[PDB]
Design an enzyme around this catalytic site. Structure first.
Site, PDB file in Angstrom:
ATOM      1  N   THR D   1      -5.165 -32.409  12.877  1.00 21.34           N
ATOM      2  CA  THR D   1      -5.940 -31.292  12.358  1.00 21.34           C
ATOM      3  C   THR D   1      -5.958 -31.319  10.841  1.00 21.34           C
ATOM      4  OG1 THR D   1      -5.397 -29.917  14.265  1.00 21.34           O
ATOM      5  CG2 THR D   1      -6.213 -28.813  12.301  1.00 21.34           C
ATOM      6  N   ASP D  17     -12.244 -31.749  10.869  1.00 22.56           N
ATOM      7  CA  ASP D  17     -12.408 -32.796  11.866  1.00 22.56           C
ATOM      8  C   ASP D  17     -12.620 -32.173  13.243  1.00 22.56           C
ATOM      9  OD1 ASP D  17      -9.883 -31.731  12.027  1.00 22.56           O
ATOM     10  OD2 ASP D  17      -8.872 -33.633  12.340  1.00 22.56           O
ATOM     11  N   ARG D  19     -10.815 -32.851  16.695  1.00 23.19           N
ATOM     12  CA  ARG D  19      -9.883 -33.352  17.702  1.00 23.19           C
ATOM     13  C   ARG D  19      -8.843 -32.301  18.040  1.00 23.19           C
ATOM     14  NH1 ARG D  19      -7.539 -39.270  16.483  1.00 23.19           N
ATOM     15  NH2 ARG D  19      -5.813 -38.452  17.748  1.00 23.19           N
ATOM     16  N   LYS D  33     -14.032 -26.453  14.865  1.00 25.45           N
ATOM     17  CA  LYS D  33     -12.937 -25.779  14.190  1.00 25.45           C
ATOM     18  C   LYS D  33     -13.396 -24.805  13.117  1.00 25.45           C
ATOM     19  CE  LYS D  33      -9.667 -29.556  14.902  1.00 25.45           C
ATOM     20  NZ  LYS D  33      -8.790 -30.547  14.226  1.00 25.45           N
ATOM     21  N   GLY D  47      -3.331 -24.802  13.589  1.00 19.95           N
ATOM     22  CA  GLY D  47      -2.161 -24.293  14.277  1.00 19.95           C
ATOM     23  C   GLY D  47      -2.374 -24.160  15.768  1.00 19.95           C
ATOM     24  N   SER D 129      -2.246 -30.464   9.882  1.00 13.80           N
ATOM     25  CA  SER D 129      -1.220 -31.499   9.911  1.00 13.80           C
ATOM     26  C   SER D 129      -1.510 -32.589   8.891  1.00 13.80           C
ATOM     27  CB  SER D 129      -1.121 -32.101  11.306  1.00 13.80           C
ATOM     28  OG  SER D 129      -2.297 -32.823  11.611  1.00 13.80           O
ATOM     29  N   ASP D 166      -3.546 -39.839   9.469  1.00 14.78           N
ATOM     30  CA  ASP D 166      -2.779 -38.952  10.324  1.00 14.78           C
ATOM     31  C   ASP D 166      -3.060 -39.274  11.781  1.00 14.78           C
ATOM     32  OD1 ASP D 166      -1.094 -36.376  10.465  1.00 14.78           O
ATOM     33  OD2 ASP D 166      -2.786 -35.963  11.801  1.00 14.78           O
ATOM     34  N   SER D 169      -5.422 -36.497  14.189  1.00 17.74           N
ATOM     35  CA  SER D 169      -6.710 -36.188  13.588  1.00 17.74           C
ATOM     36  C   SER D 169      -7.659 -37.346  13.834  1.00 17.74           C
ATOM     37  CB  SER D 169      -6.582 -35.937  12.083  1.00 17.74           C
ATOM     38  OG  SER D 169      -5.848 -34.756  11.822  1.00 17.74           O
TER      39      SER D 169
END
Lengths: 240, 240, 232, 220, 250, 228, 204, 239
Positions: D1, D17, D19, D33, D47, D129, D166, D169
């Site tokens: 994220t 993003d 996912r 999102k 979160g 993240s 990451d 993501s």
């Protein structure tokens, strides 16, 4: 009729009679005057001796709300000391929350809203008391407020409540309270309540005085005995 | 015209009327007092009189002008005990707008919350519906000045010129002839046309000690109360 | 404090709820208002006269939106209207927080009228003194509903509430049919409010809101003068 | 994220993003999102995915109620105050990291809200993240008062840094441009990662599966 | 506060109580509903009241409310009080189904509502409901059933009942034309149009002035069908064809 | 027209407390006599119908093993006060492991007797006699609908109250015996009741210091009747 | 864990103008079967189903609270529920138990009633809805089911090849799981009829 | 919360709402119940049905348990909610103390449910009277009644409703020891009393007996025709 039973009904010309009936109960209590001097407030209550059996110092019509605030009442005495409890309790929550002694423009505002809240409902009656509040501060000077049973409060240079209200505040404006200190005032408070209540209606009566200012170091307390004996020495010179 | 307890509590007459509210509009008139509010091109002026009958009463505690928020002031007509309780709500409701929403409350949204509270008293058959009126002024961005009146029925509207009190109908007949000739209004003209409203209705030609003037302007949006010295500046310029 | 907890609305010996009968008399003494649906949208129109020139007519509004696609007018007394508007604003939100969908116009009238019935039976209250007209275009077909202070509701093609409503309904019966456009319904809704207005009907004496498939909106006073032009 | 936002010379650019990973398994490849609040205010969420959904709908319901009563356009400081007073009441048990942005009367305003209730106004923020990879792009290449072509190019580069560095993501990049008069919400701004094409034909025909019992029920 | 109380709960010195008898006086006027059964099926014939020429005629019915998946009710009286009772026993049937995972028997749904309706006549200081209403339905214990409620709170099973404005005129004619267990659901439809021909003072039986709904048992369906306004008027004239022959031949 | 239930008279007493004193002039008469040998305590039944079962009604009922009771006025609301007295003696036994005295039973009921109002609805229309033997000997108390109780020596309660109280002041002395106090009370009940006295119209119960609360039955009762 | 206390597997897959849903049949307690006819797919009106997997209590509990709220919806309104509307209804029902959560993961499949268009979605145990266009899975053997559907799904599939794909996706993924099996039931719905088949699986 | 005293005292010492509610008992249909030594007999008169309608939902003789029957009069709306509150307490007694409920226990529950209910706030009193008939343990047949004020009160024969004191005067001149000799002999004792009441010509009578080991058993209108035949024929031969 029928428009004057509850306190929740207006009249067909728009006024509440339950408040006006409760105001009429004030003019059977005797007389409580209070004027403020240059640097303090002096209360004064003439007190009827109903019978010989009561004790000198009974049933005081002159209370003590906070360390610096005083109260003198006139009305139905059970309702008077009921208002004296919540005003004493209101000043405690000010100090416990805000840290310092409560001012008078806020203290008389909080009490009068509590008095006003009983002139809205059918479940309660209005109070049958009018009273006065006076104090002294070093950052504010002297204050003098008065509360009717409707819930209206104002400031005064001197006020009077009781039977002879107009007959008492006739002579108050003869004085010059803007310049006098609270020593000459004590003789002049007692004099104007001697010319009132002729000995026809009452047999004997009792003087009761109160006193606050920086001469009392801001604390509210009663006058000493010797000073009010000078005022009772100043009694029988109003016959000339 | 009447059936049941419809004269006594807030229920309907057979004619569709309800009398306890229209009994309460003429409880405003028992104050013996009249206030005038005029909106200008970049300002808004409240003018009202004060009647001090005694020299013993403190003339600094009879103000009917009240500061609701830092940018919103108001004048109160009607009976005094209900008027001061309603100011206590408006100070409280404005503080919760700032805490919940993070910006200064608009003056029309404040008048809506007051009228909704006053609606409930004429909605339940238990309470007495607070016989006093309400006039607010304030500066709103992208709207200029604006004036609102709230009556004890729960009704409200934005005005351009406003009167409330005993001489309400004679003053609105004066102001509607004043506004429909469509003169432009500066700061001093709105003050002049608001003093001369009640100076010709009441026919007094007073000195600066009987009236009091609150004002707001889009150069200093603080609600401020005029000094007796600068009231006298406008007053001697009114007599050419 | 507390309340009363007893109904002050009882049955007459003739079997009529008298307070509801008296509340309808307050509705009949209100400002006149007409509402017409015609085949693509609904027109609501009301009649707003200020008592003097001192009032700011652009301050309060009779025609109110409830959501993106539901409008609402009244004919009754003022402060009772603003209560059940704010109630109806909230009821559209608890429907949306559950179903993630705008509320149908039929389901809103289910819940506004259930307030007013609950309010005419409970203890220590007098009933409301307004009637409502509710419009909206849910799933293509438009809708037009009317409630009353008793708590019932109906589904009208065209109706009129307020003063001279018995003359308005006879006028609509000789004018309305099934096939009109929205702008044709506007011209016949101003023509029926002209039956009871004062001498001059300007751009601020009336207030008109419309629905489309594009949603509910309220007409600005500019084009209200255009519809008021070329009238009668 | 990875969510991020910036304030350019006229408005606000938000990006994210697509996912959602349950455990270490990719559950959704196109999870939206960026949420709606008002016609001028959007918000991005990170979160706990169910906690951000039910919170961003409650506040968006209340501003619809609030703006329709006041009759005018909402403000960004109101949506800040509603969020951080209810997140503090739930004592951080609602895990919702939010990036709030909108253009009210006073101009563009960008906030970042932490799930214990602490907020801060900033010109550029990153959450999620992969927030650390995106902050390094903003920290190296930010300049005040950019044009929106530079702003769209900066954010899409910063979101792409969280994609390729990451593990939790990386898919299509969403963007939204909010200005004083224009709202450009557009999900497939760029496709940096495709799926490879199949080679072998796995196709089976009808009759390769044994059936014990069949039932047919007609409808109308 | 005790001066304004109306005391809607106490008795009268003659023994009875006034407040529900005024409500059962209001149930006399304002509406007409009737039901009949003798075999497979049961019908509700209701007479519409507002017949004004500007209405939309929607919500699938006017006085017919589907309660369960296999029973429905017709209502009469104060319509605002009717909507609160309908969505009150509508979820009594669902909380039964939540508890037992079985559809509710038609009789003990009536007893559940008529205990709620009885309580307002008994304490609380409250206006009672001016609503009486019918009940049709099916269950596996007794089949097709027919019930009637009262604002006092007492119910009863029936075979034919009207609560119209001339209900007493209708019941006196229902027990002149009937047959126990042989009136199938075409003779019952023929008898229904004959009865409301009489009790409706508005003559000629306009097909939009009435509503008819039937409840027939299909194997796992229990079809509740509000029959449309294209097959009413052929049933109207079918009454009108035979009555000219039956009069002239006598 | 309608007062509250909580309104003083202009003469100053109350209304519905004074009305409940009128209600106990309709009940059956009851006589109790305190004697230093023990407390005897009797009542009539006022049998209405021949088809009525006679033993189903009762006026004497026991509170504990050493305390009996006798009720008049209304009967249906007397059963509430009896049940509160039974529970009160068991809570005293539970916590203090002794027997509650006869006086302190009575004030536990009398505090309950005036508690109606419009919060938390009418006074009780009964009148009670309490016969018991505590450690101060045999006792006899009499409460009121007003909540006033006082120790009596020979109290007559019911519709024939003042007719019996006149005839009871002339036969009582401080040195009675229990065998003749029983015989003295049945002479008074024979004068005041409607029907002729037999073994079914009345019943008695005595409490002694030695044995517990004993109630007579239709075998040992009619020897006093035939030897009246 | 808690989800592995009874096992379970639910798969939905989108076709051309049709949508299929499948589930296992085993009911058991951690090692031990009890019966092989446990219902996990429940009807919600015509052409609209729901599958539940997880803890066997909350499978039978949520499917009765949801039916409770559904019948009140379809009687207060005069119509059947859309497939998108039920997703918001279930997500409300699970989120009310935010801190007392039901241990289940629903899968919703059905056709839109007016324009016959398929719809699939899935939710976690606190109600985060996720709509897709190819397939959704839920249960203990989730990772086995992703290897099937990523390699076997085609975009536009007639109901014959849709049945063959979802059968081979279930018979191989569930066979690799230990606590799921004992039979597979397959519903495949479409605008004209509806078809329920049971597959010949390993009872091993 | 509606808190208001409804039943207050009178200026002469009565309760208005209690004595008003007893009049509403006096206009319901007449219920007559006697008892024997092994079998009890009770049956309401004035069925008064429409005689083309349903009749299994009009019953006024119900069962609280296996061993307790119950008939009533007064208005039936207040009556069946008293029964449902008595069916719960007699079941919760079984979860406590293990025996089936004695007939003396269940009448104290109904009377104490009714006395506190003239004592509470905002409540009109019940307008019913009942007869509670049962056979307890050790086989003792007995019955009771219940005033609307809540005074439970045993009997050997009773009759309430409209036209009760006429029947109750007739019962005492007719109830002998030898009338409870046979079971069917005691039934004609009821059938003679109800025929001495509101009409009761065999079509408005509905008797029901209990032989201390069974449930309540209603005879169809074939023995009610047969018993009224042999009772009137026994009167036609004596007179």
């Amino acid at each position: 009729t029928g428009y004057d039973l509850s306190a929740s009904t207006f009249s067909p010309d728009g006024r509440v009679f339950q408040v006006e009936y409760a105001m009429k109960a004030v003019e059977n209590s005797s007389t409580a005057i209070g004027i403020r001097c240059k640097d303090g407030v002096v209360f004064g209550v003439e007190k009827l001796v109903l019978s010989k059996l009561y004790e000198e110092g009974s049933n005081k019509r002159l209370f003590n709300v906070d360390r610096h605030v005083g109260m003198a009442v006139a009305g139905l005495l059970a309702d008077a000391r009921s208002l004296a409890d919540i005003a004493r309790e209101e000043a405690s929550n000010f100090r416990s929350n805000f840290g310092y002694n409560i001012p008078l423009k806020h203290l008389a505002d909080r009490v009068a809203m509590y008095v006003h809240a009983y002139t809205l409902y059918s479940a309660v009656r209005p109070f049958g008391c009018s009273f006065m509040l006076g104090s002294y501060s070093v950052n504010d000077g002297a204050q003098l407020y008065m509360i009717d049973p409707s819930g209206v409060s104002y400031g005064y240079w001197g006020c009077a409540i009781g039977k002879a209200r107009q007959a008492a505040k006739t002579e108050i404006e003869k004085l010059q309270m803007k310049e006098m200190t609270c020593r000459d005032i004590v003789k002049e408070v007692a004099k104007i309540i001697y010319i009132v209540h002729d000995e026809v209606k009452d047999k004997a009566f009792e003087l009761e005085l109160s006193w606050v200012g920086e001469l009392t170091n801001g604390r509210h307390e009663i006058v000493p005995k010797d000073i009010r004996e000078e005022a009772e020495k100043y009694a029988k010179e109003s016959l000339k | 015209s009447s059936a049941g307890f419809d004269r006594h509590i807030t229920i309907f007459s057979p004619e569709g009327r309800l009398y306890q509210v229209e009994y309460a509009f003429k409880a405003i008139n028992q104050g013996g007092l009249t206030s005038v509010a005029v909106r200008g091109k970049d300002c808004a002026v409240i003018v009202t009189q004060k009647k001090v009958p005694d020299k013993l009463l403190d003339s600094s505690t009879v103000t009917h002008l009240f500061k609701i928020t830092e940018n919103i002031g108001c004048v109160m007509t009607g009976m005094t005990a209900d008027s001061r309780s309603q100011v206590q709500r408006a100070r409280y409701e404005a503080a919760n707008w700032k805490y919940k929403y993070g910006y200064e409350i608009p003056v029309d949204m404040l008048c809506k919350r007051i009228a909704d509270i006053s609606q409930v008293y004429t909605q339940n058959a238990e309470m007495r519906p607070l016989g006093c009126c309400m006039i607010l002024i304030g500066i709103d961005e992208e709207q200029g000045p604006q004036v609102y009146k709230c009556d004890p029925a729960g009704y409200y509207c934005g005005f351009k010129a406003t009167a409330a009190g005993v001489k309400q109908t004679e003053s609105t007949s004066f102001l509607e002839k004043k506004v429909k000739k469509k003169f432009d209004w500066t700061f001093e003209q709105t003050v002049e046309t608001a003093i001369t409203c009640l100076s010709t209705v009441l026919s007094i030609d007073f000195k600066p000690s009987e009236i009091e003037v609150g004002v707001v302007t889009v150069e200093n949006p603080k609600f401020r109360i005029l000094t007796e010295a600068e009231i006298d500046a406008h007053l001697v310029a009114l007599a050419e | 404090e507390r309340g009363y907890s007893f109904s002050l609305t009882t049955f007459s010996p003739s079997g009529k709820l008298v307070q509801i009968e008296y509340a309808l008399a307050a509705v009949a003494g209100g400002a006149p208002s007409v509402g017409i649906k015609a085949a693509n949208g609904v027109v609501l129109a009301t009649e707003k006269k200020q008592k003097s020139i001192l009032y700011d007519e652009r301050s309060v509004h009779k025609v109110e939106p409830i959501t993106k696609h539901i409008g609402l007018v009244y004919s009754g007394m003022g402060p009772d209207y603003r209560v059940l508007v704010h109630r109806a604003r909230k009821l559209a939100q608890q429907y949306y927080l559950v179903y993630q969908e705008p509320i149908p116009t039929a389901q809103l009238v289910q819940r506004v009228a259930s307030v007013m019935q609950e309010y005419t039976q409970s203890g220590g209250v007098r009933p409301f003194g307004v009637s409502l007209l509710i419009c909206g275009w849910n799933e293509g077909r438009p809708y037009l509903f009317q409630s009353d202070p008793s708590g019932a509701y109906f589904a009208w093609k065209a109706t009129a509430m307020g003063k001279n409503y018995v003359n308005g309904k006879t006028f609509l019966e000789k004018r309305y049919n099934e096939d009109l456009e929205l702008e044709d319904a506007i011209h016949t809704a101003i023509l029926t409010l002209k039956e009871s207005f004062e001498g001059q009907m300007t751009e601020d004496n009336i207030e008109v809101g419309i629905c489309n498939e594009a949603g509910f909106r309220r007409l600005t006073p500019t084009e209200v003068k255009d519809y008021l032009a070329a009238i009668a | 994220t990875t969510i991020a936002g910036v304030v350019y010379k006229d408005g606000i650019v938000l990006g994210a993003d697509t996912r959602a990973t349950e455990g270490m398994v990719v559950a959704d490849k196109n999870c939206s999102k960026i949420h709606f609040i008002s016609p001028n205010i959007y918000c991005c969420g990170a979160g706990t995915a169910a906690d951000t959904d039910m919170t961003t709908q409650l506040i968006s319901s209340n501003l619809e109620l609030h703006s329709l009563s006041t009759g005018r356009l909402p403000r960004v400081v109101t949506a800040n105050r509603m969020l951080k007073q209810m997140l503090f009441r739930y004592q951080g048990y609602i895990g919702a990291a939010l990036v709030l942005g909108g253009v009210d009367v006073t101009g563009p305003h960008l906030y970042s809200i932490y799930p214990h209730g602490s907020t801060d106004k900033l010109p550029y923020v990153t959450m999620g993240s992969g927030s650390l990879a995106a902050m390094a792009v903003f920290e190296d290449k930010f300049r005040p008062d950019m044009e929106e072509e530079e702003a769209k190019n900066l954010v899409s580069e910063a979101i792409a840094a969280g994609i390729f560095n990451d593990l939790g993501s990386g898919s299509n990049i969403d963007l939204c441009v909010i200005s004083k008069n224009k709202l450009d919400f557009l999900r497939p701004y760029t496709v940096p990662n495709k799926k490879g094409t199949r080679l072998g034909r796995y196709r089976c025909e009808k009759g390769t599966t044994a059936v014990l019992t069949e039932k047919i029920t007609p409808l109308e | 506060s005790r001066r304004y109380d109306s005391r809607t709960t106490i008795f009268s010195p003659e023994g009875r109580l006034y407040q529900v008898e005024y409500a059962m006086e209001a149930i006399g006027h304002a509406g007409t509903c009737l039901g009949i059964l003798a075999n497979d099926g049961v019908l509700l014939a209701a007479e519409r009241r507002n017949i004004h020429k500007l209405l939309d005629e929607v919500f699938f019915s006017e006085k017919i409310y589907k309660l369960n998946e296999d029973m429905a009710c017709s209502v009469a009286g104060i319509t605002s009080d009717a909507n609160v009772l309908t969505n009150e026993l509508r979820l009594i049937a669902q909380r039964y189904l939540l508890q037992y995972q079985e559809p509710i028997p038609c009789e003990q749904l009536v007893t559940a509502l008529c205990d709620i309706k009885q309580a307002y006549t008994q304490f609380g200081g409250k206006r009672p409901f001016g609503v009486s209403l019918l009940y049709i339905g099916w269950d596996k214990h007794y089949g097709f059933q027919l019930y009637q409620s009262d604002p006092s709170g007492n119910y009863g099973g029936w075979k034919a009942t009207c609560i119209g404005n001339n209900s007493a005129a209708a019941v006196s004619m229902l027990k002149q034309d009937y047959k126990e267990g042989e009136m199938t659901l075409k003779s019952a439809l023929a008898l229904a149009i004959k009865v409301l021909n009489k009790t409706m003072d508005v003559s000629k039986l306009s097909a939009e002035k009435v509503e008819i709904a039937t409840l027939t048992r299909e194997n796992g369906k229990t079809v509740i069908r509000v029959l449309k306004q294209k097959e009413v008027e052929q049933l109207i004239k079918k009454h009108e064809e035979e009555e000219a022959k039956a009069e002239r031949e006598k | 027209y309608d007062r509250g239930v909580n309104t003083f008279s202009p003469e100053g007493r109350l209304f519905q407390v004074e009305y409940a004193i009128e209600a106990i002039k309709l009940g059956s008469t009851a006589i109790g006599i305190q004697t230093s040998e023990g407390v005897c305590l009797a009542v009539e039944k006022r049998i209405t119908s021949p088809l009525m079962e006679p033993s189903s009604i009762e006026k004497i009922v026991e509170i504990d093993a050493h305390i009996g009771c006798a009720m008049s006025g209304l009967i249906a609301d007397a059963k509430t006060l009896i049940d509160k007295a039974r529970v009160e003696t068991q809570n005293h036994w539970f916590t203090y492991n002794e027997t509650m005295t006869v006086e302190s039973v009575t004030q536990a009921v009398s505090n309950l007797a005036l508690q109606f109002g419009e919060e938390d609805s009418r006074p009780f229309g009964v009148a009670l006699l309490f016969g018991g033997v505590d450690e101060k000997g045999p006792q006899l108390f009499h409460m009121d609908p007003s909540g006033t109780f006082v120790q009596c020596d020979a109290r007559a309660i019911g519709s024939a109250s003042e007719g019996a109280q006149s005839s009871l002041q002339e036969v009582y002395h401080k040195s009675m015996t229990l065998k003749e106090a029983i015989k003295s009370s049945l002479i008074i009940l024979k004068q005041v009741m409607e029907e002729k006295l037999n073994a079914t119209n009345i019943e008695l119960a005595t409490v002694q210091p030695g044995q517990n609360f004993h109630m007579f039955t239709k075998e040992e009762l009619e020897e006093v009747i035939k030897d009246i | 864990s808690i989800m592995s206390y009874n096992g379970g597997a639910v798969m939905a897959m989108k076709g051309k103008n049709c949508v299929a849903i499948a589930a296992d049949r085993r009911f058991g307690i951690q090692a031990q079967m009890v019966t092989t006819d446990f219902q996990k797919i429940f009807p919600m009106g015509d052409r609209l189903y729901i599958g539940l997997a997880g803890l066997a209590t909350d499978v039978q509990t949520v499917a009765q609270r949801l039916k409770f709220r559904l019948n009140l919806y379809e009687l207060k309104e005069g119509r059947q529920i859309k497939p998108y509307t039920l997703m918001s209804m279930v997500a409300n029902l699970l989120y009310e138990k935010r801190f007392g959560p039901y241990y289940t993961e629903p899968v919703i499949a059905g056709l839109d009633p007016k324009t016959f268009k398929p719809f699939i979605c899935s939710l976690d145990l606190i109600g985060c809805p996720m709509v897709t266009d190819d397939f959704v899975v839920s249960g203990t053997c989730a990772e086995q089911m992703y290897g099937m559907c990523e390699s076997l799904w085609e975009p536009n599939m007639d109901p014959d090849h849709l049945f063959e794909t979802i059968s081979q996706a279930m018979l191989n993924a569930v066979d690799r799981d230990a606590v799921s099996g004992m039979g597979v039931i397959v519903h495949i719905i479409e605008k004209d009829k509806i078809t329920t088949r049971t597959l010949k699986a390993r009872m091993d | 919360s509606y808190d208001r005293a409804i039943t207050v005292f009178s200026p002469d010492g009565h309760l208005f709402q209690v004595e008003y509610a007893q009049e509403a008992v006096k206009k319901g249909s007449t219920a007559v119940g006697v008892r024997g030594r092994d079998i009890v007999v009770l049956g309401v008169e004035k069925k008064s049905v429409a005689k083309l309608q349903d009749e299994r939902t009009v019953r006024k003789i119900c069962a609280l348990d296996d061993n307790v029957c119950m008939a009533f009069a007064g208005l039936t709306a207040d009556a069946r909610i008293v029964i449902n509150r008595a069916r719960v307490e007699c079941q919760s007694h079984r979860l406590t103390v293990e025996d089936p409920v004695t007939v003396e226990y269940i009448t104290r529950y109904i009377a104490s449910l009714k006395q506190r209910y003239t004592q509470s706030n905002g409540r009109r009193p019940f307008g019913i009277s009942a007869l509670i008939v049962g056979f307890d343990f050790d086989g003792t047949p007995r019955l009771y009644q219940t005033d609307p004020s809540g005074t439970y009160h045993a009997w050997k024969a009773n009759a309430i409703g409209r036209g009760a004191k006429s029947v109750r005067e007739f019962l005492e001149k007719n109830y002998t020891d030898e009338a409870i000799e046979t079971d069917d002999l005691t039934i004609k004792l009821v059938i003679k009393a109800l025929l001495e009441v509101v009409q009761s010509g065999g079509k408005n009578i509905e008797l029901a007996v209990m032989r201390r080991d069974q449930s309540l058993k209603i005879l169809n209108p074939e023995e009610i025709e047969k018993y009224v035949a042999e009772i009137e024929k026994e009167k036609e031969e004596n007179e």
